[PDB]
Amino acid sequence: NNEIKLILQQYLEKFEAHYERVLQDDQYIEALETLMDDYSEFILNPIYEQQFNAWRDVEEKAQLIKSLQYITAQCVKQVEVIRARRLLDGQASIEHCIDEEFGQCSITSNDKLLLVGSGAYPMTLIQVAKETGASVIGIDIDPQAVDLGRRIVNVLAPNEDITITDQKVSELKDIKDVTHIIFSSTIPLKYSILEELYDLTNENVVVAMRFGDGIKAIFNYPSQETAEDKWQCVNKHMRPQQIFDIALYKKA
Numbered sequence: 418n419n420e421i422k423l424i425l426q427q428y429l430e431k432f433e434a435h436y437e438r439v440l441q442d443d444q445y446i447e448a449l450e451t452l453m454d455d456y457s458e459f460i461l462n463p464i465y466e467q468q469f470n471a472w473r474d475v476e477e478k479a480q481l482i483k484s485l486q487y488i489t490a491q492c493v494k495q496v497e498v499i500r501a502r503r504l505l506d507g508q509a510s511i512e513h514c515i516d517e518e519f520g521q522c523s524i525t526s527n528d529k530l531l532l533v534g535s536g537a538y539p540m541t542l543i544q545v546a547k548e549t550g551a552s553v554i555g556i557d558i559d560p561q562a563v564d565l566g567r568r569i570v571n572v573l574a575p576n577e578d579i580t581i582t583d584q585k586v587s588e589l590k591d592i593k594d595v596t597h598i599i600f601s602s603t604i605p606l607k608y609s610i611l612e613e614l615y616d617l618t619n620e621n622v623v624v625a626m627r628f629g630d631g632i633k634a635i636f637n638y639p640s641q642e643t644a645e646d647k648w649q650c651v652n653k654h655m656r657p658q659q660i661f662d663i664a665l666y667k668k669a
């Protein structure tokens with residue numbers, strides 16, 4: 418208990434200070450990015466993983482995890498907003514292909530991908546459009562993220578077929594044409610949206626759900642059990658030096 422709980426509380430306090438500073442002045446982004454790198458290195462260190470796993474508290478552990486995953490999700494968003502505003506303020510124009518996340522279920526230019534939680538700095542959305550030539554829809558509930566994302570796409574990828582909207586999945590007119598769906602990891606509602614998508618989507622749709630379980634759940638929303646007759650987990654992609662893992666879902 419004692420050891421890992423103390424560090425996790427200290428990270429929560431550090432994230433509070435860094436996040437509050439960045440809200441007042443975006444010059445403190447570099448310090449927050451460094452904290453996020455240190456946090457990542459902590460999460461992926463087998464020593465801390467073992468300590469975390471050994472802490473068999475139920476209530477306090479669960480709550481502390483939930484406090485961290487919420488504030489660090491806000492930090493991820495704030496980094497994206499600042500990076501986006503910097504690119505647009507200028508008015509000027511890596512290690513893994515997103516296609517890799519779908520294993521055998523490959524993406525061609527004839528396919529159509531929905532990315533849930535596109536974000537203000539939608540590099541992943543642009544990446545997959547450029548790599549695959551597929552049509553791409555990104556949704557984000559935050560209109561700041563919709564505006565920044567839309568205008569970044571128009572600068573960096575004007576020739577790709579990319580739509581960004583605040584529409585919920587039940588409001589997407591072309592939902593039945595979607596062949597591939599990716600969920601960003603830092604979406605609290607991702608499993609409720611997954612369940613809603615069952616009835617909305619065609620029968621052969623494939624979903625890549627990004628998540629973090631165990632110690633990775635302090636920087637990600639975790640996996641959940643799905644309704645067993647609806648979404649079947651056909652593949653789990655878990656790696657020790659990846660800050661998020663991927664669960665592939667198909668119908669029945």
Ligand SMILES: C[S@@+](CC[C@H](N)C(=O)[O-])C[C@H]1O[C@@H](n2cnc3c(N)ncnc32)[C@H](O)[C@@H]1O
Binds near residue numbers: 490556559
């Ligand atoms: C950090 S950002 C961008 C994606 C991020 N890079 C990731 O991979 O987790 C996460 C985005 O998801 C958005 N978001 C959160 N909940 C959502 C929901 N229920 N539906 C759509 N977008 C959501 C946030 O507004 C935010 O812009």
